[PDB]
Amino acid sequence: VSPSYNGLGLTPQMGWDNWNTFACDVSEQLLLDTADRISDLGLKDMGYKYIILDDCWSSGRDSDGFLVADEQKFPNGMGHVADHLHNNSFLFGMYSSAGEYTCAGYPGSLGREEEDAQFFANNRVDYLKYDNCYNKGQFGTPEISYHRYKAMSDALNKTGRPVFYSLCNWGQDLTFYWGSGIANSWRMSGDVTAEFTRPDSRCPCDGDEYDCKYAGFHCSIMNILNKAAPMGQNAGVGGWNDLDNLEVGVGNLTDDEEKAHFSMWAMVKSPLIIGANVNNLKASSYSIYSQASVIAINQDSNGIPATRVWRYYVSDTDEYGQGEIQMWSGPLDNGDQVVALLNGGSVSRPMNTTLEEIFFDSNLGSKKLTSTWDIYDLWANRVDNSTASAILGRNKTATGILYNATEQSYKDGLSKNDTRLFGQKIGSLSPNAILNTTVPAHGIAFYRLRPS
Amino acid sequence: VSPSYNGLGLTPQMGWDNWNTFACDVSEQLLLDTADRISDLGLKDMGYKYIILDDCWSSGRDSDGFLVADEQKFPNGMGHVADHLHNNSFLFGMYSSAGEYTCAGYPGSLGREEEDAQFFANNRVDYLKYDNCYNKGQFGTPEISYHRYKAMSDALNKTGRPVFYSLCNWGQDLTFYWGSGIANSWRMSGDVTAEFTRPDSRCPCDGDEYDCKYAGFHCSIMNILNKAAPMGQNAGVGGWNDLDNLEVGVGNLTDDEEKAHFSMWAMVKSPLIIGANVNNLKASSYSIYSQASVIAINQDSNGIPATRVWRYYVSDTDEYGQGEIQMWSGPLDNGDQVVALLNGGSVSRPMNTTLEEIFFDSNLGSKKLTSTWDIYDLWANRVDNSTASAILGRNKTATGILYNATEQSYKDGLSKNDTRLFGQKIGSLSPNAILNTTVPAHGIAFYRLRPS
Amino acid sequence: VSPSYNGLGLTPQMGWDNWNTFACDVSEQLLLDTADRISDLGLKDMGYKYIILDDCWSSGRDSDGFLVADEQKFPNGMGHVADHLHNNSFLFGMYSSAGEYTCAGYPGSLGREEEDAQFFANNRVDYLKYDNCYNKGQFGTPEISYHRYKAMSDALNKTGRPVFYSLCNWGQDLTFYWGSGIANSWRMSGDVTAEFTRPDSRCPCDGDEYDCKYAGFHCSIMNILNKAAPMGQNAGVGGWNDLDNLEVGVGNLTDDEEKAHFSMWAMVKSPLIIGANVNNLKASSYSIYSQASVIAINQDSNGIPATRVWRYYVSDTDEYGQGEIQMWSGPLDNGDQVVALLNGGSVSRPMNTTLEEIFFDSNLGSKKLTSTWDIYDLWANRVDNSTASAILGRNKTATGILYNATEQSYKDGLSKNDTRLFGQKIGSLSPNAILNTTVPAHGIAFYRLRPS
Amino acid sequence: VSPSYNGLGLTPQMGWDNWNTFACDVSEQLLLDTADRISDLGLKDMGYKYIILDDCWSSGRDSDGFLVADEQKFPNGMGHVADHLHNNSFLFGMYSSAGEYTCAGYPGSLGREEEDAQFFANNRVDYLKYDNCYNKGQFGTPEISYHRYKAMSDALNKTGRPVFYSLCNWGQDLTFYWGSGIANSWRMSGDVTAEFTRPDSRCPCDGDEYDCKYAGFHCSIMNILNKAAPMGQNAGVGGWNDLDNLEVGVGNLTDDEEKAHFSMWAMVKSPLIIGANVNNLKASSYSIYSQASVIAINQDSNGIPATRVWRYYVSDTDEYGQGEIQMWSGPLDNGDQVVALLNGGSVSRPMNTTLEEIFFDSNLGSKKLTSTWDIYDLWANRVDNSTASAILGRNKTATGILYNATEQSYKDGLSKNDTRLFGQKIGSLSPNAILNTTVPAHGIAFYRLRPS
Ligand SMILES: *[C@@H]1O[C@H](CO)[C@@H](O)[C@H](O[C@@H]2O[C@H](CO)[C@@H](O)[C@H](O)[C@H]2NC(C)=O)[C@H]1NC(C)=O
Ligand SMILES: *[C@@H]1O[C@H](CO)[C@@H](O)[C@H](O[C@@H]2O[C@H](CO)[C@@H](O)[C@H](O)[C@H]2NC(C)=O)[C@H]1NC(C)=O
Ligand SMILES: *[C@@H]1O[C@H](CO)[C@@H](O)[C@H](O[C@@H]2O[C@H](CO)[C@@H](O)[C@H](O)[C@H]2NC(C)=O)[C@H]1NC(C)=O
Ligand SMILES: *[C@@H]1O[C@H](CO)[C@@H](O)[C@H](O[C@@H]2O[C@H](CO)[C@@H](O)[C@H](O)[C@H]2NC(C)=O)[C@H]1NC(C)=O
Ligand SMILES: *[C@@H]1O[C@H](CO)[C@@H](O)[C@H](O)[C@H]1NC(C)=O
Ligand SMILES: *[C@@H]1O[C@H](CO)[C@@H](O)[C@H](O)[C@H]1NC(C)=O
Ligand SMILES: *[C@@H]1O[C@H](CO)[C@@H](O)[C@H](O)[C@H]1NC(C)=O
Ligand SMILES: *[C@@H]1O[C@H](CO)[C@@H](O)[C@H](O)[C@H]1NC(C)=O
Ligand SMILES: *[C@@H]1O[C@H](CO)[C@@H](O)[C@H](O)[C@H]1NC(C)=O
Ligand SMILES: *[C@@H]1O[C@H](CO)[C@@H](O)[C@H](O)[C@H]1NC(C)=O
Ligand SMILES: *[C@@H]1O[C@H](CO)[C@@H](O)[C@H](O)[C@H]1NC(C)=O
Ligand SMILES: *[C@@H]1O[C@H](CO)[C@@H](O)[C@H](O)[C@H]1NC(C)=O
Ligand SMILES: *[C@@H]1O[C@H](CO)[C@@H](O)[C@H](O)[C@H]1NC(C)=O
Numbered sequence A, B, C, D: 001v002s003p004s005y006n007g008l009g010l011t012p013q014m015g016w017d018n019w020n021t022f023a024c025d026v027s028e029q030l031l032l033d034t035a036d037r038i039s040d041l042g043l044k045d046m047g048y049k050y051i052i053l054d055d056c057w058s059s060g061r062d063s064d065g066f067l068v069a070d071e072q073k074f075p076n077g078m079g080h081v082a083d084h085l086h087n088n089s090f091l092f093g094m095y096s097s098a099g100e101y102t103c104a105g106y107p108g109s110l111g112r113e114e115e116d117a118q119f120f121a122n123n124r125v126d127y128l129k130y131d132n133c134y135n136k137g138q139f140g141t142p143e144i145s146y147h148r149y150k151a152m153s154d155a156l157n158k159t160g161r162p163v164f165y166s167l168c169n170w171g172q173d174l175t176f177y178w179g180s181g182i183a184n185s186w187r188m189s190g191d192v193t194a195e196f197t198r199p200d201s202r203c204p205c206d207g208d209e210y211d212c213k214y215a216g217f218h219c220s221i222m223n224i225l226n227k228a229a230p231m232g233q234n235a236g237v238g239g240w241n242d243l244d245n246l247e248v249g250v251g252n253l254t255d256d257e258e259k260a261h262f263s264m265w266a267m268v269k270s271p272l273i274i275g276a277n278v279n280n281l282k283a284s285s286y287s288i289y290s291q292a293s294v295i296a297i298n299q300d301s302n303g304i305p306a307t308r309v310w311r312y313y314v315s316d317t318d319e320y321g322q323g324e325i326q327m328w329s330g331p332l333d334n335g336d337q338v339v340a341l342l343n344g345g346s347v348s349r350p351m352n353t354t355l356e357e358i359f360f361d362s363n364l365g366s367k368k369l370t371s372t373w374d375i376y377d378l379w380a381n382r383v384d385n386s387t388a389s390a391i392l393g394r395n396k397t398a399t400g401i402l403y404n405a406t407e408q409s410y411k412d413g414l415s416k417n418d419t420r421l422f423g424q425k426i427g428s429l430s431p432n433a434i435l436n437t438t439v440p441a442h443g444i445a446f447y448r449l450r451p452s
């Protein structure tokens, strides 16, 4: 534990980034249309408040060496986009790289940190995603990467404008060890893709290689979760591990795959940044993003990432030879416990645990192991495909259907025993007894345990 | 071999640390009540003399930048705690981190070494445990970690007050190579836990990964012993490998597990720091901590860590799939040999060795291989559960029961053939013959060999 | 993506280097005789335009510390060789090492970069191959190797003469990450040899060890391709991965082995540098080097290295126990796709794929997966052994037989639907259908897919 | 290739070091008695000319900070020992460490290089073995270790006295890459021990881990040879890989084990430093050290370490589970080839090769593969146990029995077809035919091939 370095990131950030679905094809209009949609779907008031403009936004630098926004894409400048966002209670995120160029080859901020931070503050930006392309050999040890990322941390501080600082160096040089003192979150892997298990030659480090020398990209969901597993102990209030944008509503993930993915990102206290096109978002994916019960886990006050209790490889493997099952467990601020039974195997299987496994650091005879716990299904009462379809088609309003965190914070809701934040009680677990469930292929049993 | 850098640590340190059982809930009263108990149990006069106050003791820094003790927890200042300790023939240990913050998020000493060392000397501290949380990217190579730890070594020297300097950087950047010239001991792994074999996702480096890039914590007893195995050659008089505080009397280790753990920590010349709550210590655990014969191994003059002679995996595995058997052997200053037959398997098994294996660096026809050796059981004559229970319940005194090392040092005792320091002769081993014993699951046969 | 650092290497370089076949036995006469032959074979006008003089060319340094060409080997100086080359529309490459000495022990350029770059510019050199022998400990981290290679990059820039800068540090210290900002290409492995699969003790890093600490040499074709596989994502316009000179026409590779080797080097956008003796080049090898269709892949505008889609080990292993099969796929600027079915096994086998695998980053229902694609065999219409033998024996001219890229660029040819650049249409692949072929041992099916 | 940095080490050094058999118990008398014995046994005139005094020779430093020889062990100073050695045509070696202390805890030379080099030159020393104990964190990257070893290289040069500079840093930080420009030889592993295969917990890096982070010691013969295998390419005239002192005549190696060990150290161009006590040396070991034919391999002019052609694990394993077979081959300056068939398995086995395997870098149809080669057994005509026993017992003189390299160099002897340097012709190997032999357990077939 340490205080937040800048007072921000007291819980992981939530929002949306245009990259997965728009790439370099960005504009003021795109950003504001999306923001309007995120507001109208009631997703903004669930906490998805950072509208993060990614790469390809600039056209070069002026005679003073200042970044210039592309005037075709942003005819009114960036500050004007910020103003529209702020006027609808959004926060505005922008992008650069700690290199000569950005990943798409636009002007990068390496050695230009003071001017570039100043540009972002002049344009009323609230968040910076800060990449690792073209870093001119300034990597390879913790100390060199730390000083490069600190250069922009300090420059942003110098502006006097609070900026949520999001590192994007893919875990390179053990970022989880040094991120907290200079940043609010850090990517800890190469880019995720809409694949649950698929090994990819562009992502050469497997799930056990958390200290990876070629982060790459097109890393699968499970590859990234596995990399993140040991890293929870180095995250907490003010500084989070970042498992990359959610692929919910992107590509061809099954409903089970999307539930597993959203639930596990929540449970490890990853940022929850929508990667989908919200104006081209299907019903099942929308109700995943809108599951208040799961977001409440992610937004637990004094948040602690959950711990992987066990992992076993199974003979039920998919088309790519992949198949493993995992149990995760983690404390919650009100005294409850989050439990995940994760079936990464190719077939539906029964999955089981006990209080001894769930309360993994509790001694025999402790009050946690001696007590009875009520099991709540965190996926109960999800917005059904019909209501979701109605809301997306603008025939129904999200107001009164989705939980409004702006009106009543997750903390306050949990205190008042709000049904929408706990899911449904489905039973109880006593000492000596076992919790048994059937878990779909590439799916999850996601529970909140409460003292009876 | 090299001289002790500061004249201290001529044998490994012994004492107690409040962390395992009290965490941040510390006070003067806790410290003095515990110290009184350690004195009264006769554990102080066995050599357990460092009372080490861990994290969470400070409240901030004053207008001069000096550390301030929490005045609620320490109403009289730290120097007053030291005075009480010294008046009962104890030594006083304190804690900081070579980082911006301590592990629990209190003020750290990085870049503040001169003031902080001065604070400790002003408060009459005799020992510093010096952590590795929040190190601001100052790790990753031997040279950078060495200079950070040297900064505090030098600062402590500058005060003129002798301070036993205990490194806590978890082996990071090959500490065993550089610790000796600037420190008296160094942690060589992530934190131990009360588990004999259990792999843990928070401790991602297995037993063979001595050069680990994510030390983590909740590492099992065997995981840490295995990591330590190759490191014995880089320890000795003045500078020791530190396998973390003893879990004897903590959690739910079996009696065999606690004997194996205490015996192996002694045998590799780890510090022997009680991790138990001494005012909530069970009988079997108390008599483990009080085994004079085993402490005498640890406190051998001109101490040499023992060497692992062999390791084999066995089919008898526990609930976590773990099972291995090991033989260790090491020289003792008086010419005797310590031998350990370690059964990490899940079932009781017969275990065997010969003089050739025991005296692993002796040539055929050498006088060690040609001679007959008397076998002594170092666990013979342990304080029985009844006497231990009586002493702990304050119905019997430890005086005249436990060995008094203050009255007569371990060195002197061994010279005078003191029965309490050798255990019981159980037989002899001749050339060509084999030593056979039955060793309990997760247990040990721990012997001292003497020339007949 | 980033712009070319110096405006060169817009596509990978093509040419010839004397090393494989002449070693230190070089002279003006050798160079000009070879160049005449490369011109007359029509290989120059296919794009093989860099005549690269390798090691052993100098005799020492003069009283000013300037490099001196060996006056026995180069009686007229180097600039005179350049002039002859330029007068036949060739470009001239030379060699040094970023060390005290070159690999063969001649004067190296480390700490002498300004003078040596000046020497090369004074002698009208167009290309520098820059080795990594005898680097005086200046390696081990990205930052140190980057600064050493940057020293010569800057020195060459200072001369004002455009020089194509080719790194030869064998991938050491993750060159693919830092090469682009200071160089046009970088060797990414130890030296290739004329072996398709053979493990060699002089090349201790296997195919999966892309981050290798002892690059070595005598690395097999497949060893180097495997190392290169994850690296494609860090290559592109202006800066390429270099898989070493082609062994086509060197040693005893089969015709299938040479086709696989040439096709895969083309497909990953490696430089295509002839390693053969062109005055001692056999017919089958000549027609491999002259396959316009395959060169057009390598010289695709806005070039993207292909991606390895899958790799499986097979039971059909060669004399060295090696056997694997691979599928590669990559985009082409005009919208076509290159597909490679690679049979590294010891026997001829059927090989298969689908549109879903070929278009690996396309979603179900996308227009690429829903469309029908015409399959073109890129090895169709290769110059037959008879015509090749006739041309090599100076009985037939290459004019009107080999494609003339000087007359009409690869880009322009592809636009005009030139038959010589596409191979032969052999069928079509529809959704849901499978592409089936038989692939010879150590051979390849190499296709261009075009929308029907 | 590069020139020798200082003109020395044109072939690997030969001599003797007192450590293995005398440890810290050294004196002038020991050194001169041993030297007299090495002279009288005719071993000096075979090339064993460096008498290397190891650790524990000093008593401290004087008021000027100069090293002081222990006046009890060296009553006349070191220069006087040098004079006696030089007067019997020996060269004198001494020892320090690139650390605060030597390995045995005597004064080390780190930061004292100028004075210490001066001390050695003042005392007429010809050779320095320069250790790596207590290096004060100055390791971990190539650059830091290189600069530490360069500091003493430069200091020795500054004295103006030629000193053969022998590195002893156990291969740490890839010494084979940077040793040549500053030193004549470099240890490339932790200390050898008199075990042919035995894995040891004190030597945690196995045979494949050439880039080892804990070199350790008690490494077996095969462990060290395996580590050395890829390193041959970075050795040659002026700078050699050092596989540690020979264990021939030390401990309990079989005669086959000692022949394999001596032959392989010769063949890879390791230094050949006698580790035995020459006044307590058995007959079989003496005739191993005196095999002129094998020394001639090691002392080949323009020496090239041999290459491991293949390695296979066998089911015939020893008490430690070890068993592998290897073939090595290497060029010799006169055009001959050295071939080793190495049987590391537990039983006698037939071993076979062909000209294609022997001449591993030769193309089919080359003159080496098309020619017939005479096979010479390099172990033929070894001094029999009787003659050896007679010489050692001072009943026979070595003069006229052992080859005298002082009288006639190895180069000259080979030119004159001297029978003593070639062994005995036992047959011939033709194209298409196989060389078949039976090789004893842990033994070797060691051949020189000559064109018929
Ligand atoms: C995944 O594949 C499904 C078919 O299984 C496909 O329908 C999705 O693409 C989306 O299809 C929608 C048709 O109802 C269409 O309206 C939408 O534009 C389209 N999305 C895109 C980006 O083309 C695939 N998943 C996704 C989210 O693309
Ligand atoms: C391990 O579990 C045992 C039961 O097998 C449990 O009794 C121990 O906890 C201790 O129990 C004592 C009851 O006699 C009690 O007096 C003591 O307070 C309690 N310890 C703690 C810290 O709660 C468990 N081991 C330990 C040492 O905690
Ligand atoms: C590979 O081995 C073949 C035999 O299978 C051999 O012929 C090649 O060497 C070349 O042989 C030619 C005979 O027609 C000869 O003219 C040529 O000089 C010779 N090459 C060399 C360098 O000696 C072998 N391959 C190669 C390309 O060397
Ligand atoms: C290895 O073991 C053999 C027995 O197999 C033993 O004899 C050797 O020790 C040497 O024995 C000699 C007896 O003839 C004796 O003269 C000699 O001093 C002794 N060596 C030492 C150092 O004690 C063993 N090998 C060696 C070379 O020690
Ligand atoms: C935002 O609202 C403020 C009123 O609070 C107004 O002054 C400003 O013009 C608005 N900007 C935009 C772009 O809507
Ligand atoms: C700048 O840094 C200081 C911490 O040193 C902090 O108090 C302040 O909030 C920071 N300001 C901004 C704008 O982040
Ligand atoms: C909602 O639709 C998704 C597919 O988009 C499907 O997987 C899931 O089963 C549906 N849930 C319901 C309400 O049946
Ligand atoms: C300080 O260092 C010197 C060694 O240089 C030593 O003599 C002295 O004992 C040290 N003092 C303390 C208080 O540790
Ligand atoms: C002492 O009690 C422990 C349990 O606390 C038990 O394991 C052990 O067997 C007992 N020893 C005796 C004296 O029987
Ligand atoms: C030198 O560098 C600059 C880029 O800073 C570039 O504009 C110019 O083309 C370079 N000149 C040469 C000769 O490469
Ligand atoms: C051309 O010759 C090569 C051998 O050099 C052979 O492998 C191949 O089959 C031949 N191709 C033709 C035209 O048959
Ligand atoms: C010192 O170094 C130079 C090489 O710079 C060399 O010429 C000379 O021989 C060296 N002298 C000694 C004594 O090694
Ligand atoms: C010489 O003696 C050794 C044992 O010291 C033995 O291994 C070898 O067989 C003997 N050689 C002869 C001449 O038989």
Ligand code: NA
Binding pocket: A076, A080, A084
């Ligand atoms: Na507007």
Ligand code: NA
Binding pocket: D076, D080, D084
């Ligand atoms: Na004398």
